[PDB]
Amino acid sequence: KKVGLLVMAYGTPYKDEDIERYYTDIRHGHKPSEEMIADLRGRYHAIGGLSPLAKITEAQAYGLEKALNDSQDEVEFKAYIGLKHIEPFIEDAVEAMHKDGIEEAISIVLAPHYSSFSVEAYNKRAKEAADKLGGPRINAINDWYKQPKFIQMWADRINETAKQIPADELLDTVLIVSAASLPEKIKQHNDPYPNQLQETADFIFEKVVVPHYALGWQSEGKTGEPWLGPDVQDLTRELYGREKYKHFIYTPVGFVAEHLEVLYDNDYECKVVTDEVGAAYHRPPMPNSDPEFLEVLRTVVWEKYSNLE
């Protein structure tokens, strides 16, 4: 019998006409203003029109399914994609499993770190849909940044970039490790998210030749409350002011694909800052559907399945 593999991600507009309803969904059903829509649409336009996140997420979910099924024959996995803010929604994926007769599923979020605003909400929605339908039972993975192959993947990508920096400028190079920002109040309740990112930065740093590093956040939202900082743009300016770094290497390790928050918030907004101070910009390829990353996810899911049984 088959075990459902519920692969969850944020979602992205398929078409330009979808941007309004996607943004409305992000804002809990409250339609943004015309100025807010125009600004978002202009960011998608700046990165080429739309984001490739849709096809990357699919390649990741079906590449993971194939890696799992080609590596063993104790069980057959069947992947279902459930998205947070556009169809197929999380609830649609759970419905489809139930209608297919899946009785047992493992879920994974395509974000390696846990927080109350991200993975918690994914898991709450998946379990609430399964409770109503009467199945499947969902066994959730909460985080997986500690996976050794995950850390080694990012260190290899950073070391390949650093090898193309001149040896006499490596001492003036800094590795900026980042994730999506969240409201700062999550620290008041000891949410694990900021600690998990610091841990990820520490594990990577001990495996790369780059001698300096700093932790930052990015892509904070339009609210009137404080968000986790420093922002990667502001941190770049500060570090140039104190240390005069010549090379900035940005690894937004909270993300797993090349989407709007990397293509715009790093490759446009951070490059604007490195240009202003006169430093070089580097941003290694994201994991996307590269086989080494599919192997990270296969290890994570197969270890989860091994520990249930």
Least gap, CB of 250 to ligand FEC (angstroms): 16
Least gap, CB of 302 to ligand FEC (angstroms): 22
10: contact with ligand FEC by CB under 6 A: yes
37: contact with ligand FEC by CB under 6 A: no
251 in Cβ contact with 178 (< 8 Å): yes
Q: Which is nearer to ligand FEC, 90 or 294 (CB)?
A: 90
Core vs surface per residue 128-141: b (16+ CB within 10 A) or e: ebbeeeebbebbbb
147: tokens are: 């996976």
- Give the position of tokens 């290694």: 284
173: contact with ligand FEC by CB under 6 A: no
Least gap, CB of 220 to ligand FEC (angstroms): 8
260: contact with ligand FEC by CB under 6 A: yes
Distance of CA 257 to the CA centre of its chain: 7
Least gap, CB of 264 to ligand FEC (angstroms): 9
Options 27, 127, 187, 304; binder of ligand FEC; rule CB under 6 A = 27
Q: Cα dihedral sign for 94, 96, 97, 98? A: positive
ω before 88 within 30° of 0 (cis)?
Answer: yes
Q: Which residue from 232, 210, 116 is spatially nearest to 156, judged by alpha carbons?
A: 210
Q: Which is nearer to ligand FEC, 111 or 162 (CB)?
A: 111
Strand, helix or coil for residue 11: coil
Stretch that binds ligand FEC, among 5-13, 69-77, 202-210, 286-294 (CB under 6 A): 5-13
| Residues in 50-69 at the binding interface with ligand FEC, rule: CB under 6 A | 51, 53
Kindly list the distances between the CA atom of residue 269 and the CA atoms of 12, 136, 160, 273, 284, in Å, as whole numbers in the listed order.
Answer: 20, 43, 23, 7, 16
Q: Which is nearer to ligand FEC, 99 or 222 (CB)?
A: 222
Most distant CA pair in the chain: distance in Å? 63
Stretch that binds ligand FEC, among 124-132, 184-192, 196-204, 257-265 (CB under 6 A): 257-265
Options 49, 71, 101, 117; binder of ligand FEC; rule CB under 6 A = 117
| Residues in 70-109 at the binding interface with ligand FEC, rule: CB under 6 A | 84
156 in Cβ contact with 302 (< 8 Å): no
229: tokens are: 């900082």
12: contact with ligand FEC by CB under 6 A: yes
- Residues of the chain with a following break (C to N over 2.5 Å): none
Options 143, 191, 261, 265; binder of ligand FEC; rule CB under 6 A = 261
40: contact with ligand FEC by CB under 6 A: yes
Total residues at the site for ligand FEC (CB under 6 A)?
22
Whole-number Å distance between alpha carbons of 175 and 291 = 24
Least gap, CB of 146 to ligand FEC (angstroms): 17
| Residues in 174-213 at the binding interface with ligand FEC, rule: CB under 6 A | 180, 182
Options 221, 226, 285, 291; binder of ligand FEC; rule CB under 6 A = 221
210 in Cβ contact with 167 (< 8 Å): no
31: tokens are: 């339609």
Q: Which residues bind ligand FEC (CB under 6 A)?
A: 9-10, 12, 23, 26-27, 40, 51, 53, 84, 111, 115, 117-118, 180, 182, 221-222, 255, 259-261
